[PDB]
Scaffold this active site. Structure first.
Site, PDB file in Angstrom:
ATOM      1  N   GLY A  79       0.811  -1.230   0.000  1.00 13.80           N
ATOM      2  CA  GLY A  79       0.000   0.000   0.000  1.00 13.80           C
ATOM      3  C   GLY A  79       0.839   1.273   0.000  1.00 13.80           C
ATOM      4  N   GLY A  80       0.165   2.390   0.272  1.00 13.72           N
ATOM      5  CA  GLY A  80       0.693   3.764   0.331  1.00 13.72           C
ATOM      6  C   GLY A  80       2.116   3.857   0.836  1.00 13.72           C
ATOM      7  N   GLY A 127      18.377  12.392 -33.149  1.00 14.05           N
ATOM      8  CA  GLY A 127      17.935  12.931 -31.861  1.00 14.05           C
ATOM      9  C   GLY A 127      18.698  12.325 -30.706  1.00 14.05           C
ATOM     10  CB  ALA A 128      19.945   8.882 -30.028  1.00 13.22           C
TER      11      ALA A 128
END
Lengths: 513, 171, 513
Positions: A168-169, A403-404
Site C-alpha cells: 500500500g501507500g 535525436g539520440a
C-alpha cells in the site's frame, strides 16, 4: 539507586522488543531485527537513540493491553565512515511494523532532524499499512512522511532499504527517495497485494512474483539495487553513502588516489571494435578508464541498454551514463530514458559531475514504444541534461545518430566539453530516404537507379559524415587517442570543478510526467 | 496537471470518490509505485491554495495522495455521504476479532456484530470531522459557495519552497 | 435526505453547546457566549467556521463521558470593515474553556492560517489553563501557541480580548500579542491564582484584586485597554483593526479626509502656557492637530506621564508619543519608558509613522527608580527609537532637558525632522543648575553670592536657552508657528512616505530586558 535499577530494566525491556517468540518468528523468516540492521548500517558504538521509551496512547480493539516501548520504530543517528547519518527502522515484531500515530510522530521528528542537520536519511523498512485498530488517524501519519520526503528531495540523500513486506501507500515513501535497495526472498513492494488482485482481476500470483526484489530490480525499475542477503545490502548502502555528499551544499567527498591519472588505456584499442556491427561490454571500457576499475552501477539489472554508474576519476566522484551496445544494440527506449533521467537528476542535485559515453544508433522502434509515450519518456532524459548545472562532458566512442546524439548531452543542449574517438560516426541517418528527393535528377537518369542512389549516398556520407566532420564544425571540442580518455576526462573535470551555473527564477520547472 | 497549475499560480480543488488503486501484475510490474508517487510529489510540493472535498469514498493511500490535509491541503471538506477509512470494515473486523468469529455457535452473527461495532467507533461520516482530518462536513448544495469563500481567504497564501537546484521527483 | 437532516441536527447541537443551562449561567455572570462575541467582532455573515465538529479523545478522570463538539474553542475567519481577520474564542460552557489536546490543535491550525494569509489574529479569551484531567499532554498545547505568537510577532497584528478568567501559562499568550483588551468585573489574568497565593504567601486576596482589568490597566501595564462592557470593548477592537495594516508588508489603510490640511491651530496659543511652571492636558494639543480630534489612546490609564495614541493626519495613520505635563510634570520614569518603548516598537513593525511631542524636564529621581533599573528600562525607549525605520518627526513644545531631550527622538538618535515652537527651552539642564556648576568658583568668592548667582542664571537663560539656540546649531530643522503644527506635520510625513531605511544583518538585536 532504586531509580538506576528501574532505568536499566525498562531500557533492557525496550531493547529486547515485546517478547522473544516474536524475535524467533522474525529470525525463522531469514530476517534480522531492527536493532541488528542498525548495527550493520552504522559504525560500532555510534548509534544514539531518540524516543526508545515512547508508547502509543490509542484505545479500543485491545490496544490498551499491547503498548510496547518504541511503538514499532527505532529512530536515531550515528556515523557511516565517520559522517553523521540519521536512521529509522520498523520493528515488524510490534503490530507487523504497521504505522501508529506515535510511531509516525517519531519518524516525523527524526526526518526533521536529518533535514535540519543537512545529513543523509536511511530508512530500514519492515512494516507497511496503518494499524487497523488506530484507523484513519494513523493513516494520516503517512502524509507527514511524504511531505518530508518531498521537502528533503535534492537537499539530503534519502536511501530506502526494503527488508520486509511493504503493501500500500507506504511504498510511495521509498519511491520519493533517491535510492531503493531490496533483499531477494524477504522483501516485497506492491500498492495492492496478491489477495486483492486475485479477488478483482482473477489473476493468480504470489508475493514474490507480484513485487519481489527481482520484479522491481529487472522489470518495474522501482529498485535501484537487489542483493541475496541483508549483510551485503547494508554493506553496499555504506559504500553508496561514501560516494554521496551529506547535503546539496557540498561535493561528494574526495579520496586519495594511487591510480596515476596519466595511465594510458591501450586495452581500449582491442575492447572496442572498429567494425560498427560487432558489440562489446561498455562496462569493460568504464573499468579501464575509472580509478582501479571500481564503479557502483545503479539500476544494473533494469534497462541494461544503458549504464548508470558512480565511480572516481583521480579520487573525485563522477556519474557515468553510457549506451551498452551488447543489449538492444545500445538504443534508448522508454525504460533506459527513465533510468538515465533519474540518475542525471540525482547526480545534478548532489553536485556529482556527469560523463556521458555515446554508442547509440537511435531509439527502439515499435508500436509499443510510440503508444506508451517514448515522446514524453525520452523528453525526461533531455530535460534532466538541459536542466543540469554540474560539470558535463560527452565522449562519442562510435555511433551517435539523430535525436539520440542530441539527447545524450551534446554540446547543443549544454555539455561543457564534447570529445570523440577516431571511430566516431556522428550523423542524422536519414540520408537513405532523403536521397530520392536530393538526387532525383541523377536517379531518374537511371542505368541502374539503385546503384546510382547507393553511390550518391556513399558520396554524401564521405563529405558530411566522416570522422572529422563534427570536430571541423565545433560540434565536438577534440578528436582524441582512445588511450588518452582517462587523462582527458581528469583534466576536463579539474578545469570545470569551479563551474557555477544559475537556474531560472521559478517555483520548479514542469518536467514531462 | 497539478505541477502546471502550481507553477502558474492556479488554485487547486480536488474532489475525491476513490476506492483505491487499480490492482494487477500490469500495474505493479510497470511501476504504479513510482508513477503514483508523481501525483503525491506534485501535491506535496504545491504552494498554490489547495482545497480537497470528499464526496463519497476515500480509502487508504488514495485518500492521502488526493490532497489530504496530511500532505498539506489548506482546507478539507466532506459531504455527509463520505466514507473515509484505511480499508473496509468487513476486512478490519475480520483481523481484529478473528478469535471471537472462530468461536461462537453463529460465526456469521458475531462477524456482522463486530463489523457494526468497528463502523460505529471508526468508520462513520463524522469520524474524520471529529478528529480534524476534515475541517467541516457541508451541505452538498453549499459546495460552490464554500469553495469560493475558501479560495478567497487563501488568495494571499505565501508558502516558501526549500533551497535547492530542484527536487528529485520520481521519473 | 436523511443525511442532510442528521447534518442540520448535529450542527444545531454543536452551535448550542452541551446543555441549555450553560448559556443562562454565562449570561447570569454578565458574559456573552463565544458565538455572540464573534458576531460583534466580525461583519454580518462573514464568519466561516473550521472544525466545529471536533471532539476530544482523552480518557482520564471521567472525560470519556463528556465529548462536546468544537471542544472548548470556536475557530474561523471573517471580515472587519471588508478585510479578512482570523479569530479563536474559548467556550467557557465546555470544561470552563480550559485547553485540551484537540482544542489546542484547532488553535494551532487557525494561527497557522492567519500567518500563511498575512491577516490579523484576534483571540476572544474565556478559558483558564490546561484541563487538569488531560495533564501535561494538554499543557504542551500552549507551547505550539507560544511558538506561533512568537513567529507572528511583528508580522501580523495580534489582538487579545480578555472576556473571562485567565490563570497560569495561558496569560503569556496575550503577553506575546501586540494589544491586550480587558472587560472590568468579568475578566482577570494571573499566573498564580488567589487559592495558591493564600496557601503559600499567607496574603488574602480576591480574583479582581489580584488580576482584574483595573490592576492590569493602571498598575501592571499588561492591559492596553479596559472597558465597562463587552459591546464597547469589541467596538474598539474593530476600530483598532481599521488603523492597522493586515501584515508588515503593507501600510495602515488611508481614508478620505475632508478635515483640511490648512491651518486650524490658533487654539494652541491658549492651550499651552508660555509660563513653563503651569501644566496643560497634552491630549488637548493632539485633539487640535489630528483629523477631527479623533485618536485611540493606548495604555490610557497606565504611566499617564506619557501619551501613546493612534490618530490620522490627512487620512493617514500616525502614532503619537507625547509627555503629559499634567501628570508627574511630564517626566519619564520606568513605566512611561516601558509604555512608549512598546508603542514605538509596534508602530515601527507595522509601518506606522511616529510623531513625538516633547515637554519633558528630565527623568523621575529617586532610589525607587534607580534600584528598580530606570537605566535598563529607559534604554528600551532609546533602543525602540534608534532601531525605528518608519518616518520619525519630533516637535519640542516647551522643555527638552538633558538625556530626556535625546531619548525622545532627537535628530541625534535618527529623527528625520525635528521642529520646535517659539516656547522651546532645549538645554543640558535648568539654568539654575548649569550656572551653579559653571560659576561654582565665582559664587563661592565675592560679596552677595546669592545675587552673583541670580545674575549668572539670568545671563545663562537669556544667552544659551533662548528659543533659537538649537535651530541656530542644527539640533532642530525649524522653529514654527504653533498654529501651523498640523500642516507642517502633514507635509513632513508626505515627503517621508517613501523612506526606505536598511536594518543591520542579524538574527535580532539584543534590546534591554
Amino acid at each position: 539507586r532504586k531509580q538506576l535499577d528501574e532505568l536499566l530494566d525498562i531500557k533492557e525491556s525496550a531493547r529486547g522488543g515485546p517478547d522473544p517468540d516474536a524475535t524467533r518468528r522474525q529470525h525463522d523468516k531469514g530476517k534480522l531485527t531492527a536493532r541488528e540492521r542498525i548495527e550493520l548500517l552504522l559504525d560500532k558504538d555510534s548509534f544514539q537513540e531518540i524516543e526508545q521509551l515512547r508508547r502509543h496512547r490509542a484505545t479500543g480493539f485491545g490496544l490498551e493491553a499491547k503498548k510496547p516501548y518504541t511503538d514499532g520504530v527505532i529512530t536515531g543517528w550515528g556515523t557511516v565512515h565517520g559522517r553523521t547519518v540519521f536512521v529509522y527502522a520498523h520493528d515488524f515484531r510490534i503490530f507487523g511494523g504497521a504505522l501508529g500515530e506515535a510511531h509516525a510522530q517519531k519518524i516525523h521528528k527524526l526526518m526533521d532532524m536529518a533535514i535540519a542537520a543537512g545529513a543523509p536519511l536511511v530508512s530500514l523498512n519492515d512494516g507497511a499499512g496503518a494499524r487497523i485498530q488506530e484507523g484513519v488517524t494513523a493513516l494520516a501519519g503517512y502524509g507527514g512522511i511524504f511531505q518530508r520526503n518531498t521537502r528533503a528531495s535534492g537537499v539530503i540523500p534519502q536511501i530506502s532499504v526494503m527488508l520486509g513486506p511493504c503493501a500500500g501507500g507506504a511504498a510511495y515513501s521509498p519511491a520519493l527517495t533517491d535510492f531503493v535497495f531490496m533483499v531477494r526472498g524477504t522483501s516485497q513492494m506492491f500498492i495492492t497485494g496478491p489477495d486483492v488482485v486475485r479477488a478483482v482481476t482473477g489473476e493468480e500470483i504470489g508475493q514474490e512474483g507480484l513485487g519481489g526484489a527481482d520484479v522491481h530490480s529487472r522489470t518495474s525499475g522501482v529498485a535501484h539495487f537487489a542483493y541475496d542477503d541483508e549483510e551485503t545490502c547494508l554493506e553496499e548502502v555504506r559504500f553508496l553513502l561514501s560516494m554521496l555528499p551529506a547535503n546539496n551544499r557540498e561535493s561528494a567527498p574526495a579520496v586519495p588516489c594511487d591510480d596515476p591519472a596519466d595511465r594510458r588505456g591501450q586495452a581500449l584499442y582491442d575492447l572496442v571494435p572498429a567494425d560498427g556491427n560487432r558489440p562489446y561490454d561498455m562496462r569493460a571500457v568504464i573499468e579501464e578508464i575509472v580509478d582501479d576499475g571500481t564503479h557502483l552501477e545503479v539500476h544494473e539489472r533494469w534497462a541494461t541498454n544503458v549504464i548508470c554508474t558512480l565511480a572516481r576519476l583521480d579520487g573525485k566522484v563522477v556519474g557515468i551514463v553510457a549506451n551498452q551496445p551488447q543489449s538492444l544494440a545500445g538504443v534508448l527506449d522508454i525504460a533506459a530514458s527513465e533510468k538515465a533521467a533519474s540518475f542525471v537528476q540525482t547526480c545534478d542535485s548532489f553536485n556529482i559531475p556527469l560523463v556521458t559515453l555515446l554508442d547509440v544508433p537511435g531509439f527502439l522502434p515499435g508500436v509499443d514504444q510510440e503508444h506508451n509515450g517514448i515522446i514524453r519518456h525520452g523528453a525526461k532524459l533531455l530535460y534532466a541534461y538541459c536542466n543540469a548545472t554540474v560539470p558535463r562532458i560527452s565522449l562519442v566512442l562510435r555511433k551517435a545518430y539523430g535525436g539520440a546524439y542530441i539527447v545524450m548531452d551534446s554540446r547543443s543542449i549544454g555539455a561543457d566539453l564534447a570529445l570523440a574517438w577516431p571511430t566516431n560516426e556522428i550523423a542524422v541517418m536519414g540520408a537513405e530516404g532523403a536521397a530520392g528527393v536530393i538526387f532525383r535528377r541523377d536517379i531518374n537518369a537511371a542505368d541502374d537507379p539503385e546503384a546510382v542512389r547507393r553511390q550518391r549516398v556513399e558520396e554524401y556520407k564521405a563529405e558530411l559524415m566522416h570522422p572529422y566532420y563534427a570536430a571541423e564544425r565545433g560540434l565536438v571540442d577534440d578528436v582524441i587517442d582512445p588511450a588518452d580518455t582517462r587523462e582527458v576526462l581528469i583534466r576536463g573535470l579539474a578545469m570545470l570543478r569551479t563551474k557555477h551555473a544559475d537556474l531560472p527564477m521559478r517555483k520548479h520547472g514542469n518536467p514531462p510526467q
